[PDB]
Each structure stands twice: as C-alpha cells, then as structure tokens.
Amino acid sequence: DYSGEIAELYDLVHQGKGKDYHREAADLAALVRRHSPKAASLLDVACGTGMHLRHLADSFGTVEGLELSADMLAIARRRNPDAVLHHGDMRDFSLGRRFSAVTCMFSAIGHLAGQAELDAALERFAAHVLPDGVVVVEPWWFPENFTPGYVAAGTVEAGGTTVTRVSHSSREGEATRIEVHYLVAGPDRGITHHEESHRITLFTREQYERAFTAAGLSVEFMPGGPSGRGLFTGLPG
Amino acid sequence: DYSGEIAELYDLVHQGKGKDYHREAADLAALVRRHSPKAASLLDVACGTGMHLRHLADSFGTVEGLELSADMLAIARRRNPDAVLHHGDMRDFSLGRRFSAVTCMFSAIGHLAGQAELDAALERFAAHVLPDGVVVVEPWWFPENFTPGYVAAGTVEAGGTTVTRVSHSSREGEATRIEVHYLVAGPDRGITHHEESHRITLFTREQYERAFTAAGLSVEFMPGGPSGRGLFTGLPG
Ligand SMILES: Cc1cn([C@H]2C[C@H](O)[C@@H](COP(=O)(O)OP(=O)(O)Oc3ccccc3)O2)c(=O)[nH]c1=O
Ligand SMILES: Cc1cn([C@H]2C[C@H](O)[C@@H](COP(=O)(O)OP(=O)(O)Oc3ccccc3)O2)c(=O)[nH]c1=O
Ligand SMILES: Nc1ncnc2c1ncn2[C@@H]1O[C@H](CSCC[C@H](N)C(=O)O)[C@@H](O)[C@H]1O
Ligand SMILES: Nc1ncnc2c1ncn2[C@@H]1O[C@H](CSCC[C@H](N)C(=O)O)[C@@H](O)[C@H]1O
Ligand SMILES: [Cl-]
Ligand SMILES: [Cl-]
Numbered sequence: 233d234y235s236g237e238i239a240e241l242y243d244l245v246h247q248g249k250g251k252d253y254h255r256e257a258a259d260l261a262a263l264v265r266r267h268s269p270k271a272a273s274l275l276d277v278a279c280g281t282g283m284h285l286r287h288l289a290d291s292f293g294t295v296e297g298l299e300l301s302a303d304m305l306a307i308a309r310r311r312n313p314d315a316v317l318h319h320g321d322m323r324d325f326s327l328g329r330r331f332s333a334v335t336c337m338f339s340a341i342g343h344l345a346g347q348a349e350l351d352a353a354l355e356r357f358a359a360h361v362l363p364d365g366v367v368v369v370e371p372w373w374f375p376e377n378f379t380p381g382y383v384a385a386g387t388v389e390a391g392g393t394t395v396t397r398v399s400h401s402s403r404e405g406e407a408t409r410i411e412v413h414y415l416v417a418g419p420d421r422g423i424t425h426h427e428e429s430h431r432i433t434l435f436t437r438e439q440y441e442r443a444f445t446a447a448g449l450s451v452e453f454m455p456g457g458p459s460g461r462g463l464f465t466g467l468p469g
Numbered sequence: 470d471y472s473g474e475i476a477e478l479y480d481l482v483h484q485g486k487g488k489d490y491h492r493e494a495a496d497l498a499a500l501v502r503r504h505s506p507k508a509a510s511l512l513d514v515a516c517g518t519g520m521h522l523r524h525l526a527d528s529f530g531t532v533e534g535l536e537l538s539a540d541m542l543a544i545a546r547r548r549n550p551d552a553v554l555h556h557g558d559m560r561d562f563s564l565g566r567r568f569s570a571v572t573c574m575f576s577a578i579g580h581l582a583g584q585a586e587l588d589a590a591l592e593r594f595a596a597h598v599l600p601d602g603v604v605v606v607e608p609w610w611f612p613e614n615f616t617p618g619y620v621a622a623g624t625v626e627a628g629g630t631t632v633t634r635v636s637h638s639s640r641e642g643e644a645t646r647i648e649v650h651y652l653v654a655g656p657d658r659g660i661t662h663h664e665e666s667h668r669i670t671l672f673t674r675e676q677y678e679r680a681f682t683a684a685g686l687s688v689e690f691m692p693g694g695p696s697g698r699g700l701f702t703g704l705p706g
Contacts, residue, residue, distance in 0.1 A: 381656030385631050387622050394622050396633045398652045400660050413660045415635045415650050419618030423637050423650045425662055 234280070237426050239303035241414060243281050245397050248388030256337070256458045257287030260368065264292075264333040267366045267467060271332030275360055277322045277353075278340030282308025282315075289315060292332070298325055322353045332365040334358075339461060341440075342372030342408075342432035350435060350443040358447035358468060367449055367466040370457060375434045377461075378408060393418045407431045440464055471517070474663050476540035478651060480518050482634050485625030493574070493695045494524030497605065501529075501570040504603045504704060508569030512597055514559045514590075515577030519545025519552075526552060529569070535562055559590045569602040571595075576698060578677075579609030579645075579669035587672060587680040595684035595705060604686055604703040607694060612671045614698075615645060630655045644668045677701055 234242070264271050272293045276285050279297035281304055289295045289312065297317040299305040309317050318327065322336065323344070334357040344350050357367045373379075382401045387394065396415040401408050414426040437453060441464075444451035449466030457463035471479070501508050509530045513522050516534035518541055526532045526549065534554040536542040546554050555564065559573065560581070571594040581587050594604045610616075619638045624631065633652040638645050651663040674690060678701075681688035686703030694700035 383631050383654045383656060385624050385633055385652075385654065387624060387633070394620050394635065396622055396624070396635060396652065398631065398633060398654050398660055400654055400656075402659075411660055413652050413662060415622075415633065415652060417620045417622065417635050417637055419620060419637075422639075423635055423648055423664075425650060425664075427660075427662075 233428070234301040235303045237414070237416070237424075238428055239281070239301065239307060241395055241397075241416065241426075242304070243283065243307070244388055244390055244393075244395055245386075245414075246283075247390075248386050248395070248397075253283040254287050257284050257291070259458070260284065260333075260335060260337075261288060261291040263368065263465070264366055267465075268332045268362070268364045271365065273331040274333045274335065275327070275331040277334060277336045277357065278343075279308055279317065280304050280338070280340070282311045282317065284335070284337055285315060285317075286311050294331070296327070296331070298322060298327075322356060323349055324352065325356060327360060330360050330362045330365070332362055333368060334361045334365070335368045337368075337370045338459065339370055339372040339432065341369050342435070343430075344433060346433065347435075347439060347442070350439065351446050354443040354447040354449070354466075358449055358466070361468060363468050365468070367444070367447075369440070369444075369464045369466070370459065371435065371437075371440055371461055371464060372432050373408070373434065373461055374437050375406075378403065378434055393421070403434075404431065407433050470665070471538040472540045474651070474653070474661075475665055476518070476538065476544060478632055478634075478653065478663075479541070480520065480544070481625055481627055481630075481632055482623075482651075483520075484627075485623050485632070485634075490520040491524050494521050494528070496695070497521065497570075497572060497574075498525060498528040500605065500702070501603055504702075505569045505599070505601045508602065510568040511570045511572065512564070512568040514571060514573045514594065515580075516545055516554065517541050517575070517577070519548045519554065521572070521574055522552060522554075523548050531568070533564070533568070535559060535564075559593060560586055561589065562593060564597060567597050567599045567602070569599055570605060571598045571602070572605045574605075574607045575696065576607055576609040576669065578606050579672070580667075581670060583670065584672075584676060584679070587676065588683050591680040591684040591686070591703075595686055595703070598705060600705050602705070604681070604684075606677070606681075606701045606703070607696065608672065608674075608677055608698055608701060609669050610645070610671065610698055611674050612643075615640065615671055630658070640671075641668065644670050
C-alpha cells in the first residue's frame with residue numbers, strides 16, 4: 233500500500249534522493265519518438281504521483297495514467313488537472329483506446345506476485361499500445377544483481393518539515409523485503425514515526441522476456457536505465 | 470533516564486554532532502589551573518560516559534566521577550578502567566574527600582527540578598572542592614535564550630550501523646520538553662526505532678547565582694562556553 237502519510241511524503245523523499253523526473257521524461261519521450269515518429273499519446277501505468285506525466289504532457293498531446301492507490305492518484309490528479317487519470321489495476325484494466333506508448337516506471341512491475349500476474353500485465357500493456365508504438369517497463373533488480381542487507385538513509389527539509397527516511401532490504405524467498413521507516417518533524421508537529429513494508433518480486437531477466445513474448449511483443453533490455461536496474465522495451469508484431 | 474540503547478548510542482550521536490570532548494577537557498584543565506596552579510585532582514559530576522574524564526586523566530593525577538545512571542556509568546568505567554567512578558546522586562552524595570575542581574558539564578544540572586534541588590547540588594559541590602579550587606557548572610539555556618520549536622536532525626555511521634537522531638524542543642511551563650527519536654539500522658539488524666523524552670529545567674541566571682552564593686561560592690558567568698550556553702565558575706570563600 234501507498235496510502236496516507238506514505239503517499240504524502242513520496243515526492244519530497246524522492247526529490248531528496250535526487251530523482252530527476254524531468255530528465256527521465258525527456259529521455260522517455262525521445263525513446264518513444266525514436267520508435268514512433270508521429271507518436272502523440274502515452275499511458276503511464278502505475279503513475280504514482282504523476283511526476284513523469286506532468287513532464288510528458290509538455291511533449292505529447294494526450295497523456296493518461298492508471299494507478300491503483302487512490303491516495304497516490306489524488307496527488308497525480310492535482311499535479312495534472314487537465315489529464316485523464318484512471319483508477320485501476322495494471323493486471324486487468326480496459327480503457328477502450330490505444331496509445332503510442334505504454335510505460336511502467338520505477339519498478340512498479342515488481343509489485344506483481346509471480347509469472348501469471350506479470351504475463352497478465354504485459355498482455356494488458358500490449359492491448360493498449362499502437363502497432364508502431366512501444367511498451368516500456370523499468371524492472372526491479374534481477375536476483376543476480378540484488379544486494380541483500382542494503383541500508384539507505386537520507387534527510388530532506390522543505391517548508392519547515394524535516395523528513396528522515398531509512399530503508400533496509402533483505403531476501404525473502406523470491407522477493408525482496410523492504411522495510412522503510414520515517415521520522416517527520418517540525419516546530420509545531422513535534423516528531424512522528426511511520427513505517428511500512430513491501431515485498432517486491434525478484435523476477436529474472438528471462439521471466440520478463442517471457443511475459444513480453446507471450447504478449448506478442450519483441451523485447452530488448454538496456455542496462456543502466458534511470459535507476460541502475462535497466463529498462464525493457466517491447467514493440468508489437 | 471539514560472538507560473539501554475540511549476546510553477549505548479550517546480557517544481556515537483555526539484561524535485556525529487561534532488562535540489569535541491578533547492578540546493573541552495583541555496580548556497577545562499587550563500581553567501582549573503588558572504585558579505589553582507597546583508591543582509592535582511578533579512571530580513566530574515554527572516560524568517555520563519566519561520568522555521571528559523578520559524581526557525582530564527591525562528592532565529590530573531586523580532580524576533573521579535559521579536553518575537546516577539548505571540548504564541552510562543558502565544560505559545564510563547570501561548573507558549576509564551584505572552579511575553574511581555562512583556554511583557550516586559548529585560543532590561546528596563558524600564565522597565569523604567575534596568578535589569581541586571568539581572565539574573558538572575553539558576547542562577546535566579538542568580535535570581534538577583527546582584531551586585531546592587539546585588541549591589542542594591551546589592552545596593554538595595562546595596562540600597567537595599578545595600579552598601583554592603573551582604566549581605564549574607555548564608547551565609542549561611536561560612528562559613530568555615531558549616528557542617521553542619527547535620528541530621535538530623543528524624545521521625552518523627560507524628562499524629556498519631547507521632543512526633539517525635531527531636530532537637524537538639518545546640516550552641512546558643518552567644522547563645523544556647525535549648523529545649528525541651532514533652532510527653538505528655544495519656545490514657543484519659534491520660531498522661529499530663527508539664524514543665525518549667526529557668524535562669530540562671529553565672533556571673534563570675539569577676537562580677544559578679543564588680545557588681552558588683548559598684553554597685559559599687563567588688560566582689561568575691562567561692557567555693558562549695562549550696555549547697553556546699555559557700559557563701558558571703564558583704570559587705570558595
Ligand atoms: C545499488 C543497488 C541497490 N539495490 C537495491 C537495494 C534496495 O532494495 C534498493 C535501494 O534502496 P532505496 O534507495 O530505498 O530504493 P527505492 O526507494 O527505489 O526502493 C524501494 C522500492 C519499493 C518500495 C520501497 C523502496 O535497491 C540492489 O538490489 N542492487 C544494487 O546494486
Ligand atoms: C541554538 C539554540 C538551541 N537551543 C536549544 C534547542 C534544543 O533544546 C537544544 C539543541 O538541541 P540538540 O542539538 O538536540 O541538543 P542537546 O542534545 O544538547 O539537547 C538535549 C539536552 C538534554 C537531553 C536531550 C537533548 O538547544 C536554545 O534553546 N537556544 C538556542 O539558541
Ligand atoms: N497492480 C497495480 N496496478 C496499478 N498500480 C499499482 C499496482 N501495484 C502497485 N501499483 C502502484 O505502483 C506504484 C509504485 S511507486 C512508482 C510510481 C511512479 N511510476 C514513479 O515513478 O514515481 C505505486 O503508486 C503503486 O500504488
Ligand atoms: N541527579 C543526578 N545525579 C547524577 N547524575 C545525574 C543526575 N541527573 C542526571 N544525571 C546524569 O546527567 C547526565 C546528563 S548527559 C551529560 C553527560 C556528560 N557530562 C557529558 O558531557 O557528556 C546523564 O549521564 C545523567 O544520568
Ligand atoms: Cl510544524
Ligand atoms: Cl547489522
């Protein structure tokens with residue numbers, strides 16, 4: 233879940249971590265146009281708080297989003313008041329139109345539980361992409377590149393609020409268990425503590441490739457990517 | 470209270486905050502010798518983890534400590550294995566000897582509850598100081614210099630452990646309420662959260678002066694001091 237204070241802190245936490253959604257969006261837009269020169273529309277699946285979408289809207293005449301968390305989607309709609317942002321589930325949704333690109337960024341795909349859900353999501357992405365368009369999926373880490381025991385800590389301040397965030401990652405079967413704690417402080421607020429836990433699936437490279445292929449997409453992996461985890465692209469046909 | 474993990478984290482937290490106990494001790498030793506040129510002994514009251522004492526031992530032939538927290542004192546004794554460190558209460562203790570200096574550092578005096586306890590502690594300090602010696606007390610903030618709403622945050626790493634500490638200070642009658650939260654993280658540890666709360670008395674400058682005078686000490690205040698809170702010195706007679 234991405235509800236409540238988690239959702240409210242998300243953008244500030246990733247700004248403090250230095251995530252550059254503007255540069256990621258410009259790179260994404262150029263990648264789409266590389267494959268589809270007259271591309272004019274984009275669907276961002278698991279769009280979160282709509283940071284990519286806000287920048288992509290400066291580049292594509294139609295951008296839409298899909299998000300399962302109502303609290304994340306509320307922030308996305310406020311950020312993107314002129315865009316249609318849909319509530320729904322990447323495993324099983326139907327918008328009744330296709331787009332030049334279908335994107336799923338920042339390892340959101342790792343919230344799927346196993347091969348059947350991964351295959352289902354990829355088939356939905358293929359069902360929403362145009363024939364000269366592109367499906368873009370930023371994976372979670374592969375098992376061979378996952379670092380168990382990893383601790384990340386950072387602090388950011390904005391508007392009078394100080395937020396400290398610490399994460400810890402461990403191996404739990406075929407998933408990463410990530411525990412995240414926050415201290416949120418301010419002159420009137422005092423200090424409040426928050427915590428959450430995620431299980432993010434460690435799909436192998438071959439499992440992603442299998443899901444793309446079963447959806448009718450030809451698949452390519454590029455290492456590095458916006459987060460060090462690489463990027464998969466898929467073209468219909 | 471200064472027990473358990475609080476005590477265990479104390480030195481790492483103040484090292485990350487940049488507290489320089491070596492420089493503070495050299496300054497203290499020179500201040501004592503300024504008043505008592507043949508000074509050879511020192512008692513550090515509320516000595517905590519014994520950081521000042523460890524450096525003062527390089528300068529005075531006899532250093533002793535007094536500390537009410539068994540967990541702080543355990544760390545102090547490990548740091549100072551050749552020194553006599555006493556368990557007891559600054560309000561009412563009796564060592565049966567006097568010292569060239571009696572010191573009480575880093576606002577430990579603010580854990581006393583009102584004028585009667587402050588007067589009692591100062592009388593005990595005078596009862597343990599030699600006639601050419603000096604009593605040194607680092608006060609808490611005076612009401613006029615206290616900053617309500619203050620938030621301090623910092624993170625330090627050592628040995629594989631990451632510690633984030635956040636404090637928040639507010640006014641609660643004639644005391645500061647300080648809330649402190651910690652996140653302690655490591656590759657095997659995971660993340661653990663700890664909290665504590667202190668009530669530190671906001672004695673006025675005149676209240677400190679009154680306690681010194683009632684103990685038979687002539688009192689001087691020097692602003693700035695090791696922590697921005699100044700320093701009181703008191704000479705018998
Ligand atoms: C260099 C490196 C890191 N990691 C893992 C270790 C850890 O799991 C993650 C880095 O931690 P954090 O910066 O908190 O990342 P996010 O907020 O993106 O993760 C979340 C994802 C989902 C929900 C919550 C948090 O990458 C690896 O597995 N391999 C690597 O080489
Ligand atoms: C500049 C400034 C600060 N402060 C206050 C505001 C706040 O109360 C304190 C600074 O906070 P922190 O760095 O956490 O200090 P310690 O660990 O020494 O405090 C503890 C004391 C006892 C138990 C726990 C913590 O000084 C003032 O009152 N006036 C000032 O001008
Ligand atoms: N089955 C699902 N369908 C749609 N969104 C999902 C989902 N499972 C998880 N999510 C969403 O996946 C997101 C992961 S955080 C990534 C958000 C965004 N793409 C960004 O780059 O910042 C969350 O917003 C979460 O609610
Ligand atoms: N009545 C009392 N008698 C003795 N020590 C006391 C006390 N009340 C509080 N203390 C001690 O006061 C200390 C405050 S922290 C300061 C410790 C040390 N002087 C330093 O500079 O680091 C704690 O170790 C606490 O246990
Ligand atoms: Cl606030
Ligand atoms: Cl550890």
